[PDB]
């Protein structure tokens, strides 16, 4: 299937 978004934050 389609796009999978990650969750972006400050490391």
């Amino acid at each position, epitope marked *: *299937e*389609g*796009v*999978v*978004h*990650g*969750v*972006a*934050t*400050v*490391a």
Partner: nanobody
Framework: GGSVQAGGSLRLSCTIS????????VGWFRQAPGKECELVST???????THSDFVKGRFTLSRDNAKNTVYLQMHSLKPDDTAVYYC???????????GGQGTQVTVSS
């Protein structure tokens, strides 16, 4: 999100579906205010990393050794790096890469 003065550094983290992390390239994308989404860099499960032309060695990618996280290490940040940064896999266009939960990066002069 992270905010720095010009010349500074900032490390971002992207946690993404484990099934995806194990099998697919993960892309970092960014979108500056009033501008379109653009692809920044990618990293594969074997830690092959690609970069767009505007990176010029300043941003590097790595995968965590234990968890489903990819890191974007940024150095020598400039005000024009101010943007919301995002990560995604299996995108059908670059526009899709900025559709998820992003983090605001602000670089002040």
């Amino acid at each position: 999100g992270g905010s720095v003065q010009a010349g500074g550094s900032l490390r971002l983290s992207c946690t993404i579906s484990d099934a995806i992390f194990s099998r697919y390239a993960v892309g970092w994308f960014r979108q500056a205010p009033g501008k379109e989404c653009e692809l920044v860099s990618t990293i594969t499960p074997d830690s092959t990393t690609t970069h767009s032309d505007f990176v010029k060695g300043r941003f590097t990618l790595s995968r965590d050794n234990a968890k489903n996280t990819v890191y974007l290490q940024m150095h020598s940040l400039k005000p024009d790096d101010t943007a919301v940064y995002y990560c995604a896999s299996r995108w059908r266009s670059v526009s899709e890469g900025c559709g998820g939960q992003g983090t605001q990066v602000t670089v002040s002069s």
